[PDB]
Amino acid sequence: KLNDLCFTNVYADSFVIRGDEVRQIAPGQTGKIADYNYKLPDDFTGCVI
Amino acid sequence: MTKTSVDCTMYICGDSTECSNLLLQYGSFCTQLNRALTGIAVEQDKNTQEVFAQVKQIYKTPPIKDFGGFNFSQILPDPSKPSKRSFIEDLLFNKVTLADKFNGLTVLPPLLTDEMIAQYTSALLAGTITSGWTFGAGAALQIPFAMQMAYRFNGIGVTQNVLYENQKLIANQFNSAIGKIQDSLSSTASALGKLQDVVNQNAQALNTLVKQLSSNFGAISSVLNDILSRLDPPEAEVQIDRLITGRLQSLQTYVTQQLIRAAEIRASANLAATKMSECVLGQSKRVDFCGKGYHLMSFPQSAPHGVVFLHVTYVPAQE
Amino acid sequence: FNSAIGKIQDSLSSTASALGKLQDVVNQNAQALNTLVKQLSSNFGAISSVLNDILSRLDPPEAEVQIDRLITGRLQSLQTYVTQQLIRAAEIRASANLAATKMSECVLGQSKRVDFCGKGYHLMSFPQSAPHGVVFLHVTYVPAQEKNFTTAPAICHDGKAHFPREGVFVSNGTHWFVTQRNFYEPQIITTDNTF
Amino acid sequence: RSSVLHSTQDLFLPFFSNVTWFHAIHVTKRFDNPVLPFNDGVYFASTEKSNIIRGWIFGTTLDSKTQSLLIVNNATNVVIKVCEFQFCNDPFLGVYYHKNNKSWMESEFRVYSSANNCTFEYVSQPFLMDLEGKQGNFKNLREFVFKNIDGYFKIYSKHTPINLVRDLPQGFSALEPLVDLPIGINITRFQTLLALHRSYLTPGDSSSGWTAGAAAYYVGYLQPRTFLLKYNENGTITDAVDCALDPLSETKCTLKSFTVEKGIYQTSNFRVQPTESIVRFPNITNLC
Amino acid sequence: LVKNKCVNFNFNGLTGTGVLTESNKKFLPFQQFGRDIADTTDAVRDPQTLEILDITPCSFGGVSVITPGTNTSNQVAVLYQGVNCTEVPWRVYSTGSNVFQTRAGCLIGAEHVNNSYECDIPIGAGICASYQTSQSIIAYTMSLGAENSVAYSNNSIAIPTNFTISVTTEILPVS
Ligand SMILES: *[C@@H]1O[C@H](CO)[C@@H](O[C@@H]2O[C@H](CO)[C@@H](O)[C@H](O)[C@H]2NC(C)=O)[C@H](O)[C@H]1NC(C)=O
Ligand SMILES: *[C@H]1O[C@H](CO)[C@@H](O[C@@H]2O[C@H](CO)[C@@H](O)[C@H](O)[C@H]2NC(C)=O)[C@H](O)[C@H]1NC(C)=O
Ligand SMILES: *[C@@H]1O[C@H](CO)[C@@H](O)[C@H](O)[C@H]1NC(C)=O
């Protein structure tokens, strides 16, 4: 349903990480790289690719 | 109080069909709440019926204005003026106006149009002046007003001769007193006090309520249309379910609140009806039932969502 | 009185309208209880309405959650009933006070208040028991026929004017006699009836 | 349920619904039994005397490639199959009056070519049929409601001994379910089976040799509607009111009683529906 | 853009349903969304056309059917509550054999008489419905009762010559 609504100020992010911590990069849940490199908000909205 | 009927279906679920299905699961809460409000709505009309439909037949005010030295121009309806509202009565809507569907909410109109209420009040006023207390108990019997007043004195223990000996003195005081009352209503910013609060309190509940829909209630969005578009049904329910639970709460509080308020108004209506039957139709022996002091008679008046009573009382000035 | 009582018997047998004011209370209470009882059927967001069925097919932790949901839904249902019941109870209580008042005040003594008991002057009242209610029969006096008479407040005999002791002065137009304001009895005016 | 009024949102023939009558009577050179469209409400109400309408056909395209339904109404049972049958363009049941023995035998049972496989085969409860070879008014009546819901094929029936009414009889009768079959077949349309009354006076061939005579059947569709159904002490549904059909009728559902006293009753909310959907997104052409 | 017709509207991921007509109130160059006192949007700006449209919801209403009573007759009168009489047109019932626009809604199925009778089947804002005027539900203006003025004069009095004793029953719930 991302096609039929107008958002505000879309942001894109990009980096390289190991294969295991791709599950680790999620809102709320803790993690080493998630606590030292990139901490998402607890109510983050968007899609991770 | 203003008849308010709120449709359980439209408020909670909103326009969307998907939202409606969850409401069906809950049961007859939707249906039950609407019934309670309708009961309240009937009471406000019915209450009105009890308080003002005290007379079988409207009595036209006599064309002759002879009042035995009593001037009733303020109290009685004016033909020249539109809407048949008395100077007191015509102005009150003035005063009330100065003091004073859209969404999910329809405010239903009352069974008795303000115009009709005006006629009822006039009939009682016309009935009291022309026929004394005879109209209350049966077919109205014409009586001289001076003579009616004579009977009133006898009830409170002051001999009738007393009225007749200084009718002129009494008439002037009464006329002056009525004039004082007219000025008092207009001059005071807030004399109606109690009547005003009934209207303000009801308005606050609705705003609070109208304001209540905006509240998040622990959901990602406060809008059913907005939440539905953003979320699918399958995992939709957790947020769709809750908003519904929270909103149901708003209605129940409002519905419960209305009943308590309605009950208070009903007691007031019945008290007010009692005064109307007890004081307007005949003299009341009970002390401090009608105003203050010894009571001679009362004249009913009409305001929006209220009844204003003018009480005529006898007090001993000098000792 | 006999004919008057006879009519009331006929009126009562011919219609349910007399007990409508009372019956509305009976029906309204019955309907409220019935809705709540039915409530039991509603799911309230749960997998299934019957409580036992839910417990039988669900493991304790899951069963825990569904049970809680039912209780919240069922707690709310109960709350509405109790809250509703109280308002109705209070309303009924007022009637009983009024009910109790009508039971005693119309029945014991005579009420001078106009229209508090029946319509018109209340000579006496009788109460008849009804299911979940009290019915009061009111005997009242209403004056049926009125004859126009010219009247005046005082009569001047020697430069001193008399007034009636208990009744308004009423004159056919030939002579002046004093009669009680509610029934037409004419008495030759005398010192005994005046001051 | 006994003495309780219940409202069930189950497909029903709308009350006073339009009904398309059909004729299978020669009374000159008249014989018609063509395919009819089928929706949820496949209500079939044949009226027969000498038992001329017998079976039914269900299916999607009747191509012998999509799974389809088919029946015979024999003296033994209402015999049913689910099979990939190849039907002819003019199927029927044939009965002949023999001079040597007075009995009606099947002459050509070429209703279908072969069946590819069966995912369901079935025989219903035993009953008996009169099979008379005479002429007369249709003393009896037969009603059926074919329905397809949640992967189940279902049927309902009643025999009514109505007398001498061309139209469907005024009154109330309630169909009783006869059979439930769990099937996945999707069927767009259905057809009926006739009994050809072959005799000695006929030419004596499959294309022109027939004197079928009188027959009559009516088909009415079924749409989702809410019925308030009255239940008797025994439980027979003696009477029912349709809430959807009339303003008066809708009041009864809200009132939950067959008889309504004089007054004002609020039954349902009224809402308008937007004529067009208008989207006015930013006019910019450049793409992100 | 479509105007004067209830249509679903979507503006930048915001969706509402109403009739969109030009709104006289003038907004600032920067202002985009106009909202009402009850926190419901009452206005928008066309993103493409830069024009102001006022949004009002598509008239709803409760339906009440006035019945003389099942036993007496089957005829019904339906008063939509609040909705305008022109509004919309069960299909057969729509058109109003006797459409009449009242002040309490939009009656359809009763004939407005000129005469006034006692109340029977209350409706709202004066109007009442009766099954008695071959038979048709008629909505009257509910005049309060016979208007007679007691004959008045300073020297005129009326005194009863006969009295009637009557019995009246009042019914109150106790439990
Ligand atoms: C007062 O009213 C009563 C009741 O209407 C009258 O009594 C009736 O008088 C008529 C005519 O004489 C009789 O035929 C009836 O049988 C009486 N009873 C009733 C109930 O009508 C009485 O005549 C009237 N006048 C008085 C007492 O002066
Ligand atoms: C009945 O036989 C037919 C014809 O052989 C079967 O139809 C084939 O089914 C296979 C497997 O599903 C498909 O790949 C073919 O395209 C189908 N057509 C043909 C001609 O082979 C059918 O599956 C069989 N069984 C039934 C209907 O139960
Ligand atoms: C009553 O007072 C009004 C107000 O000025 C006056 O116009 C009228 O003539 C008076 N009528 C009386 C005493 O009847």
Ligand SMILES: *[C@@H]1O[C@H](CO)[C@@H](O)[C@H](O)[C@H]1NC(C)=O
């Ligand atoms: C009073 O007038 C009435 C009516 O004319 C008459 O019947 C009655 O006799 C009068 N009083 C006397 C004493 O004559």
Ligand SMILES: *[C@@H]1O[C@H](CO)[C@@H](O)[C@H](O)[C@H]1NC(C)=O
């Ligand atoms: C039924 O069809 C006939 C065709 O002549 C038509 O006149 C009638 O209006 C239709 N009625 C309904 C309810 O569809």
Ligand SMILES: *[C@@H]1O[C@H](CO)[C@@H](O)[C@H](O)[C@H]1NC(C)=O
């Ligand atoms: C049913 O058959 C029809 C034939 O027109 C087809 O359009 C439809 O897709 C089929 N549906 C299902 C569920 O098989």
Ligand SMILES: *[C@@H]1O[C@H](CO)[C@@H](O)[C@H](O)[C@H]1NC(C)=O
């Ligand atoms: C219903 O039950 C009653 C019991 O008295 C019986 O007389 C009647 O035959 C029964 N009818 C049906 C249709 O079962």
Ligand SMILES: *[C@@H]1O[C@H](CO)[C@@H](O)[C@H](O)[C@H]1NC(C)=O
């Ligand atoms: C109903 O709409 C018409 C449109 O022409 C208008 O004339 C009339 O004043 C409206 N009345 C109400 C109550 O909306």
Ligand SMILES: *[C@@H]1O[C@H](CO)[C@@H](O)[C@H](O)[C@H]1NC(C)=O
């Ligand atoms: C008393 O007053 C009227 C005045 O017209 C008189 O004719 C009649 O005797 C009585 N009627 C009434 C008050 O209606």
